[PDB]
């Protein structure tokens, strides 16, 4: 929701720029040598979501998850060279390979004492659980346990049956990741393919055979298993053994490709046709996802290229990344276009026609159910536990929540933003020159609330448009990534519509700064100054985006990109969270509920449990978060605020009467609406009862005081809604939704109309 | 109080007779429910028995 | 468009009505404008808004 | 008191009649008569209002109600419909044109 | 009352457990020596493989014993304890103060603890053991000290 003045970003969100995209200080952004059409029109992109639970209980390949954890680590910076770790691991594995005599040995005891080892016995193997850690001991202790998985890989095998007994699970729960990506991300996938493949091979299994693998026999058998283990290992390894080699190298390929792209480059800095021609890597040029992708990296990298194959690249690694082979890279072919659709945008635009304020909006769902859970332990002095949960409220509230849910569309936001409008002999765009743009992405911020960090910095991150550490690098990157996306869609989207698709390289502060973009066209519209203009014969062009969006006209989204948000473990039964505590909040709550009527103050509080039905408040019972909505709420909230404000002034300045006169009513209307929101939710039983409790109580104090049987009168409505309204407000507190501060102050600015519609008389 | 409770106890919901003064036990503006007791039994229209 | 924002129509109309009052002196100049005076709002009532 | 512990609020001891509740399914009637309540108060004064729902007679499963008079009919105590519980009483009143009475 | 019956006549003598008390004392005993030997066997193990062989051989089976015992908790009678049990506790915190605790029943350890104990307890009114003798089973506590992860 950064509101920004056209004819500046290079300040306005300074470093949120194409320039920035170069780095590019605040030079260029220009035209026009060479120019060069490409519209690679597809991308490889992904989809929503990457969070999950992932309880491990019966590990069996399926990388993904793992990988995802890996990423969680990878991301965690407690992994990064995750890859490396796999090497380590490779080695670890390898060392597994190297200690068989141990391993076996170890095994050998584990079950179960060796040398006759035969027969249907009774071999109540176990939850193997601990043992492993001996094996760890005997092992080295590389990160977490891979190690263990592997165990499971034999475990289940080791069992025909019996030969492992029953076990539990844990929890881990991958968090979410990107939508767009970068390089490093790429290579790993490939490596992941190994890794998965490593594990692919790894289950496999050897069956039950004989009167052995069938009917337990042979110490020498399992001496053969161990061998099997070896077999596995090896094989696994083997399928591994050549393949790993190219990472920087890949970049280089990019760099080739880039250098294909380059098109003004030295002659003997061509990719020869033999290359140029070959396989669909060329197709690959004409494959966006990447395109956009390279450059940046390279921005980092300033360049560097391996120089290697021309014959395996061409192009074998190349479609080793047949990229999408991992969907981990859910960077998967996309007709480019098919995204966006969480973008609608709509704009406010003046008379000439000429513009005003452009909103690109982000389109959501927000349906949600709660997740109010028993926080206990189980594991003392060690937290990986499952705890529990129950409904009671959760449902009740949710049931209430739902309705709220009903009310709130992004549509409605925009509607409201429509509501903003009005204008007059006002206001620009041409008059005074700077033009608004806002793009609804509270969402980002949401995550930030989820990430519990201060937004303002984020604002700064825009503001400066660059990095603004001071504090957790983790966070920072996190932010950064967000920002990537931030750049990221946009121009696709623009482009989606805009097949103004050519390149001239910009060649920064000189010349060799291979940054490609296209100017885009703006075709018709006679005249604008809006932008650091061109105006290229009334058909401005720029490789700078916003305006182009300006020369859309209200596009729609085409999904709200729903919003499935992860949840409880339900099948939770052992398992153990991982970051949770943060991720949970107690429902305390302070504040109250009182009125003084007559002169007589009637008074109450909040007293949470009882609002909630049963007893009784305590430290425990914690609640999972309510994020989405905060992001939303404040929006609603935020709007008004400006509007009165801005209005008030205009109301002031009123050089003529009419207008002033005019504006208000509309401003009045919405309030009522507000009101309408609130009482509406104020009706809800759980609310109402609350009122109930109140009234009685209100009364109770009152009872001594009160004396007069003055009748009908307060059938004069008030109370109903009055309270209801008020009651609604409670909701806001008791699910802290909006702070105490703002809303009462908003209230404050309210104070009338209310007698609206109504009996009167 | 201790032991810890004080009788879940009863109230009634009279509203029968309208705007009426009778002790701090109410009034109950407009609407009337009312908690305690005798009066309420007063608060009906009188009758005969049937036993 | 703008002053398709109603006003005028009634605005004037209203006002016009007031003329009636004068041109058939009905109510004095004095009182009604002072009543007017005490008026001054709501008027955006019902209406398009928004 | 067990039962006491049922009229509640809010006595989530066991989370109110609960695990013990689940033995039950006879519970049902007990409650349903007003008469039944009436004793309680007696305890309140008497036992000063006793303590710990009597230790449940330690869960005595489903058997001690079955010592009651409704399950061991010793006393006249007459399940009688509330309405008819008495009714030889009608009401009567004053008024000053009040129209209330006084 | 453990039967569930306050608190009848009080005058029962019981046909005694001629068979099993003994058979158990075989069982029992059988177990009991074995640990000696086994420990010893570990001692006399002076390489890993043997020790290691002992491990499980030592382990699992005990909990199996436990498997019996909790299992024999899944009975009426186990339950009689249990129900009785927690409840009485429950009041002790809740009734007294803090109520923040059901959970406290619900981690293995204790759970099992009571369960087991109780289970063993049964035996003790089945005569069988001695509290003393159970206590050596309690000496099983030091070992491995693994124990009780997960259930049921």
SS (H, E, C) A272-335: CHHHHCCCCCCCCCCCCCCHHHHHHHHHHHCCCCCCCCCCCCCCCCCCCCCHHHCCCCCCEEEE
Report the residue of A609, A612, A613, A615 to disrupt the D interface, i.e. the one with the largest count of D CBs within 10 Å.
Answer: A615
Question: If you measure CA to CA, which chain B residue comes closest to D86?
Answer: B51
A314 phi and psi angles, rounded to 5 deg: -70, 115
Q: How many CB atoms lie within 10 A of CB E85?
A: 15
CA-atom Rg of chain D in angstroms:
19
**In a 10 Å sphere around its CB, with 0-12 CB exposed, 13-18 middle and 19+ buried, how is residue D30 labelled?**
middle
> Which method resolved this structure?
cryo-EM
Question: If you measure CA to CA, which chain E residue comes closest to A615?
Answer: E99
Whether residue A734 contacts residue A606, with contact meaning beta carbons closer than 8 Å, is answered with: yes
Q: How many residues are recorded in chain B?
A: 51
Angstrom distance (rounded) from CA E91 to CA A733: 34
Whether residue A735 contacts residue A397, with contact meaning beta carbons closer than 8 Å, is answered with: yes
Which residues fall within 8 angstroms of residue A548, CB to CB, at 6 or more apart? A494, A498, A500, A520, A522, A542
Chain B: closest CA distance from residue A701 (Å): 10
Query: Strand A622-624 relative to strand A436-439: parallel, antiparallel, unpaired?
Result: unpaired
CA-CA distances (angstroms) from residue B3 to A390, D37, E96?
30, 18, 11
Whether residue E2 contacts residue E81, with contact meaning beta carbons closer than 8 Å, is answered with: yes
Whether residue A504 contacts residue A35, with contact meaning beta carbons closer than 8 Å, is answered with: yes
Structure letter (DSSP) for residue A713: G
Chain A residues touching D10 at Cβ < 8 A: 609-610, 613-616
Q: How many CB atoms lie within 10 A of CB A692?
A: 13
Q: Do B42 and D87 touch (CB under 8 A)?
A: no
Structure letter (DSSP) for residue D21: G
Question: If you measure CA to CA, which chain B residue comes closest to A712?
Answer: B30
Angstrom distance (rounded) from CA A458 to CA A435: 22
SS (H, E, C) A544-586: CCHHHHHCCCCCCCCCCCCCCCCCCCCCCCCCCCCCCCCCEEE
Sign of CA dihedral A730, A735, A736, A737: negative
Report the residue of A392, A393, A608, A614 to disrupt the D interface, i.e. the one with the largest count of D CBs within 10 Å.
Answer: A614
**At A356, is the secondary structure helix, strand, or coil?**
strand
Angstrom distance (rounded) from CA A293 to CA A296: 6
Chain A residues touching C7 at Cβ < 8 A: 658, 661-662
Chain E: closest CA distance from residue D60 (Å): 6
Angstrom distance (rounded) from CA A249 to CA A629: 45
Chain A residues touching C2 at Cβ < 8 A: 424
β-partners of residue A43 are A334
Structure letter (DSSP) for residue A424: -
Angle between helices A247-261 and A183-202 (to 10 degrees): 140
Chain D residues touching B17 at Cβ < 8 A: 100
Angle between helices E20-44 and E48-58 (to 10 degrees): 160
Helix (H) or strand (E) holding A194: helix A183-202
CA-atom Rg of chain B in angstroms:
14
Q: Do B21 and A711 touch (CB under 8 A)?
A: no
Closest alpha carbon to B43 in B25, B8, B16: B16
Tell whether omega for the bond before A537 is within 30 degrees of 0, i.e. cis. no
Q: Do A109 and E53 touch (CB under 8 A)?
A: yes
Whether residue A52 contacts residue A64, with contact meaning beta carbons closer than 8 Å, is answered with: no
Angstrom distance (rounded) from CA A66 to CA E69: 38
Structure letter (DSSP) for residue C12: H
Chain B: closest CA distance from residue D78 (Å): 16
Whether residue A535 contacts residue A528, with contact meaning beta carbons closer than 8 Å, is answered with: yes
| Facing residue for E64 by CB, picked from A113, A124, A377 | A124
Longest Cα separation, chain C: 38
Angstrom distance (rounded) from CA A108 to CA E57: 12
| Facing residue for B26 by CB, picked from A703, A711, A712 | A703
CA-CA distances (angstroms) from residue A152 to A52, A85, A117?
21, 21, 21
Angstrom distance (rounded) from CA A672 to CA A750: 10
In the complex, which subunits touch B with 3 or more CB pairs below 8 angstroms?
A: A, D
A508 phi and psi angles, rounded to 5 deg: -5, -130
Which residues fall within 8 angstroms of residue A415, CB to CB, at 6 or more apart? A409
**At B41, is the secondary structure helix, strand, or coil?**
helix
Angstrom distance (rounded) from CA A131 to CA A338: 51
Structure letter (DSSP) for residue A431: S
Which residues fall within 8 angstroms of residue E147, CB to CB, at 6 or more apart? E63, E141
A645 phi and psi angles, rounded to 5 deg: -70, -60
Report the residue of D6, D7, D9 to disrupt the A interface, i.e. the one with the largest count of A CBs within 10 Å.
Answer: D9
Q: How many CB atoms lie within 10 A of CB E148?
A: 17
CA-CA distances (angstroms) from residue A149 to A144, A239, A395, A573?
11, 19, 38, 20
Chain E: closest CA distance from residue D34 (Å): 27
Angstrom distance (rounded) from CA A680 to CA A705: 32
Chain A residues touching C47 at Cβ < 8 A: 665
Q: Report the C-alpha dihedral over residues A563, A565, A571, A575, rounded to 10 degrees.
A: 160
Q: Which phi-psi region, left, alpha or beta, contains residue A345 (left: φ > 0; alpha: ψ -120 to 50)?
A: beta
CA angle D80, D84, D90 (to 5 degrees): 150
Angstrom distance (rounded) from CA A735 to CA A724: 16
DSSP H helices, chain E, are 20-44, 48-58, 61-73, 76-96, 108-124, 131-138
Chain B residues touching D9 at Cβ < 8 A: 8
A690: number of CA atoms within 13 Å, CB side?
Answer: 31
Angstrom distance (rounded) from CA C36 to CA E70: 90
Angstrom distance (rounded) from CA A619 to CA B14: 41
Which residues fall within 8 angstroms of residue C10, CB to CB, at 6 or more apart? none
Query: Strand A622-624 relative to strand A372-373: parallel, antiparallel, unpaired?
Result: antiparallel
Angstrom distance (rounded) from CA A141 to CA A89: 10
Question: In units of Å, what resolution does this entry have?
Answer: 7.5
Closest alpha carbon to A150 in A59, A51, A213: A59
Q: Do A661 and C50 touch (CB under 8 A)?
A: no
Closest alpha carbon to A635 in A426, A398, A348, A420: A420
b (16+ CB within 10 A) / e for A54-76 = bbbeebebebbbbbbbbbbbbbe
Start-to-end Cα distance in chain A = 44
Q: Do A105 and E48 touch (CB under 8 A)?
A: yes
Query: Strand A436-439 relative to strand A354-362: parallel, antiparallel, unpaired?
Result: parallel
**At A336, is the secondary structure helix, strand, or coil?**
helix
Angstrom distance (rounded) from CA A290 to CA A45: 10
Chain A: closest CA distance from residue D10 (Å): 6
A677: number of CA atoms within 13 Å, CB side?
Answer: 19
């Amino acid at each position: 929701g950064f509101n920004l003045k056209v004819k500046d970003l290079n300040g306005s969100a300074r470093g949120l720029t194409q320039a920035f995209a170069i780095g590019e200080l605040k030079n260029q952004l220009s035209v026009g040598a060479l120019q060069l059409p490409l519209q690679f029109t597809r991308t490889f992109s992904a989809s929503m979501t990457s969070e999950l639970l992932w309880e491990v209980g019966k590990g069996n390949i399926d990388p993904v998850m793992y990988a995802r954890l890996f990423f969680q680590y990878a991301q965690a910076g407690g992994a990064l060279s995750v890859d490396e770790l796999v090497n380590q691991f490779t080695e670890y594995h390898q060392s597994t390979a190297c200690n068989p005599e141990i391993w076996r040995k170890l095994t050998a005891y584990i079950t179960g004492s060796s040398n006759r080892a035969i027969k249907a016995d009774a071999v109540g193997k176990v939850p193997p659980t601990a043992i492993l850690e001996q094996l760890r001991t005997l092992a080295p202790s590389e990160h977490e346990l891979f190690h263990h998985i592997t165990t499971d890989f034999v475990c289940h095998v080791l069992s025909p049956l019996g030969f492992i007994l029953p076990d539990a699970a844990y929890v881990y729960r991958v968090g979410r990741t990107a939508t767009y990506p970068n390089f490093y991300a790429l290579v790993d996938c490939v490596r992941a393919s190994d890794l998965r493949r490593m594990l692919t091979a790894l289950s496999s299994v050897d069956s039950k055979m004989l009167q052995a693998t069938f009917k337990a026999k042979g110490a020498l058998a399992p001496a053969l298993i161990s061998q099997h283990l070896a077999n596995a290992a090896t094989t696994a390894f083997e399928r591994s053994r050549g393949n790993f080699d190219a990472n920087a190298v890949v970049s280089s390929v990019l760099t080739i490709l880039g250098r294909l792209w380059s098109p003004s480059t030295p002659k003997e800095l061509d990719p020869s046709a033999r290359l140029r021609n070959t396989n669909g890597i060329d197709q690959l040029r004409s494959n966006l996802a990447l395109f956009i992708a390279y450059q940046d990296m390279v921005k980092q990298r300033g360049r560097a290229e391996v120089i290697f194959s021309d014959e395996e690249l061409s192009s074998t690694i190349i479609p080793w990344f047949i990229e999408a082979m991992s969907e981990v890279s859910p960077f998967k072919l996309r007709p480019i276009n098919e995204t966006t659709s969480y973008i609608g945008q709509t704009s406010a635009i003046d008379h000439m026609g000429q513009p005003s304020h452009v909103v690109v909006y982000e389109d959501w769902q927000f349906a949600k159910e709660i997740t109010a859970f028993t926080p206990v332990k189980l594991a003392n002095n060690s937290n990986q536990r499952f705890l529990d949960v129950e409904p009671g409220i959760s449902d009740r509230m949710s049931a209430t929540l739902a309705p709220i849910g009903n009310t709130f569309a992004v549509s409605a936001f925009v509607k409201n933003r429509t509501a903003v409008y009005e204008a007059v002999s006002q206001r620009g765009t041409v008059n005074s020159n700077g033009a608004e743009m806002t793009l609804g992405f509270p969402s980002v911020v949401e995550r930030d609330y989820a990430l519990d960090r201060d937004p303002m910095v984020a604002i700064a991150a825009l503001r400066t448009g660059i990095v603004d550490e001071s504090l957790e690098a983790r966070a920072s990157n996190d932010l950064k990534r967000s920002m990537f996306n931030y750049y990221a869609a946009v121009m696709h989207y623009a482009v989606a519509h805009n097949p103004e698709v050519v390149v001239s390289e910009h060649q920064g502060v000189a010349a060799e700064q291979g940054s490609l973009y296209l100017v885009w066209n703006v075709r018709t519209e006679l005249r604008i100054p809006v932008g650091y203009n061109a105006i290229e014969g009334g058909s401005i062009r720029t490789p700078e985006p916003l305006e182009a969006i300006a020369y859309n006209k209200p596009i729609q989204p085409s999904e709200v990109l729903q919003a499935k948000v992860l949840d409880l473990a339900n099948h939770t039964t052992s398992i153990h969270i991982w970051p949770w505590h943060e991720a949970s909040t107690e429902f305390a709550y302070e504040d109250a509920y009182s009125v003084t009527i007559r002169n007589k103050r009637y008074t109450a509080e909040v007293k949470e449990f009882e609002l909630l039905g049963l007893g009784q408040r305590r430290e425990r019972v914690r609640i999972l978060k309510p994020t989405v909505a905060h992001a939303i709420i404040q929006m609603w909230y935020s709007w008004f605020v400006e509007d009165d404000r801005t209005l008030a002034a205009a109301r002031r300045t009123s050089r003529d009467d009419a207008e002033k006169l005019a504006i208000d009513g509309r401003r009045m209307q919405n309030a009522v609406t507000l009101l309408r929101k609130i009482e509406m939710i104020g009706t809800t039983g759980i609310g109402a009862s609350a009122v109930h409790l109140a009234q009685s109580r209100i009364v109770d104090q009152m009872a001594g005081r009160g004396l007069i049987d003055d009748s009908s009168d307060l059938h004069v409505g008030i109370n109903r809604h009055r309270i209801r309204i008020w009651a609604g407000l409670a909701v806001l507190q008791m699910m802290g939704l909006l702070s105490r501060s703002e809303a009462e102050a908003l209230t404050k600015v309210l104070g009338d109309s209310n007698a609206l519609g109504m009996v009167v008389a």
